[PDB]
Enzyme design. Structure first.
Site, PDB file in Angstrom:
ATOM      1  N   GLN A 114      34.467  35.720  31.928  1.00  7.20           N
ATOM      2  CA  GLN A 114      35.192  34.395  32.069  1.00  7.20           C
ATOM      3  C   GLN A 114      34.299  33.207  31.531  1.00  7.20           C
ATOM      4  O   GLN A 114      35.055  32.597  31.249  1.00  7.20           O
ATOM      5  CB  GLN A 114      35.872  34.158  33.058  1.00  7.20           C
ATOM      6  CG  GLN A 114      37.112  35.455  33.572  1.00  7.20           C
ATOM      7  CD  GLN A 114      37.817  35.055  34.712  1.00  7.20           C
ATOM      8  OE1 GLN A 114      37.286  35.458  35.895  1.00  7.20           O
ATOM      9  NE2 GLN A 114      38.966  34.169  34.722  1.00  7.20           N
ATOM     10  N   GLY A 125      38.294  34.311  42.726  1.00  7.02           N
ATOM     11  CA  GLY A 125      37.218  35.108  42.168  1.00  7.02           C
ATOM     12  C   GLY A 125      36.961  34.709  40.948  1.00  7.02           C
ATOM     13  O   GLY A 125      37.574  33.874  40.445  1.00  7.02           O
ATOM     14  N   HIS A 165      41.011  43.300  39.885  1.00  6.15           N
ATOM     15  CA  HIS A 165      41.215  41.992  38.846  1.00  6.15           C
ATOM     16  C   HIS A 165      40.068  41.557  38.306  1.00  6.15           C
ATOM     17  O   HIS A 165      39.853  41.438  37.076  1.00  6.15           O
ATOM     18  CB  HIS A 165      41.980  40.828  39.723  1.00  6.15           C
ATOM     19  CG  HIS A 165      42.134  39.807  38.845  1.00  6.15           C
ATOM     20  ND1 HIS A 165      43.497  39.284  38.275  1.00  6.15           N
ATOM     21  CD2 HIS A 165      41.147  38.912  37.859  1.00  6.15           C
ATOM     22  CE1 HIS A 165      43.398  38.194  37.716  1.00  6.15           C
ATOM     23  NE2 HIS A 165      42.103  37.916  37.436  1.00  6.15           N
ATOM     24  N   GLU A 166      39.001  41.568  39.207  1.00  2.00           N
ATOM     25  CA  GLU A 166      37.581  40.882  38.543  1.00  2.00           C
ATOM     26  C   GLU A 166      36.853  42.173  38.042  1.00  2.00           C
ATOM     27  O   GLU A 166      36.492  41.812  36.887  1.00  2.00           O
ATOM     28  CB  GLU A 166      36.788  40.282  39.906  1.00  2.00           C
ATOM     29  CG  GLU A 166      37.312  39.273  40.792  1.00  2.00           C
ATOM     30  CD  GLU A 166      37.715  38.255  39.593  1.00  2.00           C
ATOM     31  OE1 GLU A 166      37.431  37.992  38.722  1.00  2.00           O
ATOM     32  OE2 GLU A 166      38.460  37.243  40.287  1.00  2.00           O
ATOM     33  N   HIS A 221      38.135  42.150  34.454  1.00  2.00           N
ATOM     34  CA  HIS A 221      37.659  41.372  33.561  1.00  2.00           C
ATOM     35  C   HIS A 221      36.194  41.791  32.766  1.00  2.00           C
ATOM     36  O   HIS A 221      35.970  41.624  31.491  1.00  2.00           O
ATOM     37  CB  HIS A 221      37.421  40.006  34.168  1.00  2.00           C
ATOM     38  CG  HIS A 221      38.372  38.975  34.235  1.00  2.00           C
ATOM     39  ND1 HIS A 221      39.289  38.591  33.142  1.00  2.00           N
ATOM     40  CD2 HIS A 221      38.803  38.237  35.288  1.00  2.00           C
ATOM     41  CE1 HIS A 221      40.118  37.648  33.701  1.00  2.00           C
ATOM     42  NE2 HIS A 221      39.955  37.554  34.830  1.00  2.00           N
ATOM     43  N   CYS A 263      45.385  33.859  36.948  1.00  2.77           N
ATOM     44  CA  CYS A 263      43.849  33.935  36.371  1.00  2.77           C
ATOM     45  C   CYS A 263      43.289  32.826  35.718  1.00  2.77           C
ATOM     46  O   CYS A 263      44.534  32.145  35.182  1.00  2.77           O
ATOM     47  CB  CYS A 263      44.202  35.135  35.133  1.00  2.77           C
ATOM     48  SG  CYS A 263      42.633  35.627  34.446  1.00  2.77           S
ATOM     49  N   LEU A 264      42.346  32.485  35.883  1.00  2.32           N
ATOM     50  CA  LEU A 264      41.910  31.104  35.612  1.00  2.32           C
ATOM     51  C   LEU A 264      41.855  31.031  34.018  1.00  2.32           C
ATOM     52  O   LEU A 264      41.781  30.095  33.441  1.00  2.32           O
ATOM     53  CB  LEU A 264      40.453  30.651  36.175  1.00  2.32           C
ATOM     54  CG  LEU A 264      40.729  30.530  37.786  1.00  2.32           C
ATOM     55  CD1 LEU A 264      39.332  30.231  38.389  1.00  2.32           C
ATOM     56  CD2 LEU A 264      41.523  29.343  38.003  1.00  2.32           C
TER      57      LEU A 264
HETATM   58  C1  BB2 Z   1      44.993  38.195  43.037  1.00  2.00           C
HETATM   59  C2  BB2 Z   1      43.984  38.803  42.188  1.00  2.00           C
HETATM   60  C3  BB2 Z   1      42.819  37.974  41.836  1.00  2.00           C
HETATM   61  C4  BB2 Z   1      43.006  36.586  41.356  1.00  2.00           C
HETATM   62  C5  BB2 Z   1      41.708  35.893  40.773  1.00  2.00           C
HETATM   63  C6  BB2 Z   1      42.102  34.637  39.924  1.00  2.00           C
HETATM   64  C7  BB2 Z   1      40.635  34.230  39.357  1.00  2.00           C
HETATM   65  C8  BB2 Z   1      40.430  34.814  38.124  1.00  2.00           C
HETATM   66  O1  BB2 Z   1      41.001  34.478  37.296  1.00  2.00           O
HETATM   67  N1  BB2 Z   1      39.393  36.096  38.279  1.00  2.00           N
HETATM   68  O2  BB2 Z   1      39.231  36.680  37.482  1.00  2.00           O
HETATM   69  C9  BB2 Z   1      42.759  33.967  41.114  1.00  2.00           C
HETATM   70  O3  BB2 Z   1      42.155  33.029  41.768  1.00  2.00           O
HETATM   71  N2  BB2 Z   1      44.087  33.658  41.088  1.00  2.00           N
HETATM   72  C10 BB2 Z   1      44.968  32.897  42.210  1.00  2.00           C
HETATM   73  C11 BB2 Z   1      46.013  34.045  42.598  1.00  2.00           C
HETATM   74  O4  BB2 Z   1      46.387  34.833  41.669  1.00  2.00           O
HETATM   75  N3  BB2 Z   1      46.204  34.060  43.747  1.00  2.00           N
HETATM   76  C12 BB2 Z   1      45.630  33.213  44.945  1.00  2.00           C
HETATM   77  C13 BB2 Z   1      46.341  33.620  46.143  1.00  2.00           C
HETATM   78  C14 BB2 Z   1      46.652  35.108  45.745  1.00  2.00           C
HETATM   79  C15 BB2 Z   1      47.010  34.922  44.395  1.00  2.00           C
HETATM   80  C16 BB2 Z   1      48.433  34.747  44.321  1.00  2.00           C
HETATM   81  O5  BB2 Z   1      49.227  35.401  44.658  1.00  2.00           O
HETATM   82  C17 BB2 Z   1      45.553  31.758  41.486  1.00  2.00           C
HETATM   83  C18 BB2 Z   1      44.484  30.507  41.469  1.00  2.00           C
HETATM   84  C19 BB2 Z   1      46.380  31.721  40.484  1.00  2.00           C
HETATM   85 NI    NI Z   2      41.204  36.488  36.211  1.00  2.00          NI
END
Ligand code: BB2
Ligand code: NI
Length: 164
Positions: free
Chosen positions: A50, A45, A132-133, A136, A90-91
């Site tokens: 961001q 997401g 989460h989104e 932000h 989070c990115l």
């Molecule tokens: C889970 C809640 C949403 C997370 C969104 C983030 C992206 C973000 O920064 N959005 O604002 C993401 O992709 N994060 C991933 C993430 O947290 N994940 C991806 C698989 C599920 C979870 C890890 O437990 C990784 C890339 C760090």
């Molecule tokens: Ni995030």
């Protein structure tokens, strides 16, 4: 185009997004660029805040094959229930993850990429991601739910990663 993703401790990450006035070509360009960014950075997401666009625009893809686009424009939480929590990353907080409390299920109303309204009930990872989104969009980050010690540890790791 791929956009730069803001990182902590940037204050722009605390800005409260305004609602999208109209879903037009400009907004669709933003949505498409957000998807490109999300996929390039391997997220599931991204929120407009961001990428320094303070409008209520969220793009999501929680599919295994990364071919399921979901667009939430002016999302509004209608109902929620239960509690849950997974280790979220989070990115804007590269390489760090932690568990934070979240609703288990959510029902939201939003506008799609075409500006058409829709309702969506979600659970599992999609409900966690939506939350989460949406956070932000009101200037909130997952690390905000953690102790000062954990927040400081995360801040230092991100700054070092960025320094290198
Ligand atoms: C889970 C809640 C949403 C997370 C969104 C983030 C992206 C973000 O920064 N959005 O604002 C993401 O992709 N994060 C991933 C993430 O947290 N994940 C991806 C698989 C599920 C979870 C890890 O437990 C990784 C890339 C760090
Ligand atoms: Ni995030």
């Amino acid at each position: 185009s791929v956009l730069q993703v803001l990182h902590i401790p940037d204050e722009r990450l605390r800005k409260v997004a305004k609602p999208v006035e109209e879903v037009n070509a400009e907004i669709q360009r933003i949505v498409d660029d957000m998807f490109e960014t999300m996929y390039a950075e391997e997220g599931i997401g991204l929120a407009a805040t961001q990428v320094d666009i303070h409008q209520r625009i969220i793009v999501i893809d929680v599919s295994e094959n990364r071919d399921e686009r979901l667009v939430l424009i002016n999302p509004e939480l209608l109902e929620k229930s239960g509690e849950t929590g997974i280790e979220e990353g989070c990115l804007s907080i590269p390489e760090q993850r932690a568990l934070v409390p979240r609703a288990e299920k959510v029902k939201i109303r939003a506008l799609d990429r075409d500006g058409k309204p829709f309702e969506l009930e979600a659970d599992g990872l999609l409900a966690i991601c939506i939350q989460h989104e949406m956070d932000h969009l009101v200037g909130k980050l997952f690390m905000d739910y953690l102790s000062p010690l954990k927040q400081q540890r995360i801040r230092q790791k991100v700054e070092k990663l960025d320094r290198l």
